[PDB]
Write a protein that binds this DNA or RNA. Structure first.
Length: 49
RNA sequence: GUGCUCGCUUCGGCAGCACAUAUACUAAAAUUGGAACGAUACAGAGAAGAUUAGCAUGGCCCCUGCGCAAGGAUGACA
């Protein structure tokens, strides 16, 4: 994940590992990329793409 | 090597004499081997109970039925 830990806070590193389990950061990035691709696809005649 | 012997002997030289007394891992070079938790690659919830559904058994208290043993009170003229 893109979380930076400013100090070993063990009671928070675990709660952040739980939240971003199963590669949630990568899936969020992929989902946003795909949603932007779709919106640019629906607008390609007016946008001259 | 320096200096000296009344030495041979000549200043071209020779013989002897005093001092000098035992350094070095010694090494400039020879070669072929075995090698990360450093990177990238993979995984990554990197600390939880490792569960909850029935029925029957076991304990206590009644009720009913059957059996065993030992008994109590009562009833019946022609």
């Amino acid at each position: 994940t893109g979380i930076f830990m400013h100090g070993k806070i063990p009671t928070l590193k675990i709660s952040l590992i739980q939240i971003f389990r199963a590669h949630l950061w990568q899936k969020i990035h992929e989902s946003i990329v795909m949603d932007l691709c779709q919106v640019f696809d629906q607008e390609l005649d007016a946008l001259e793409i």
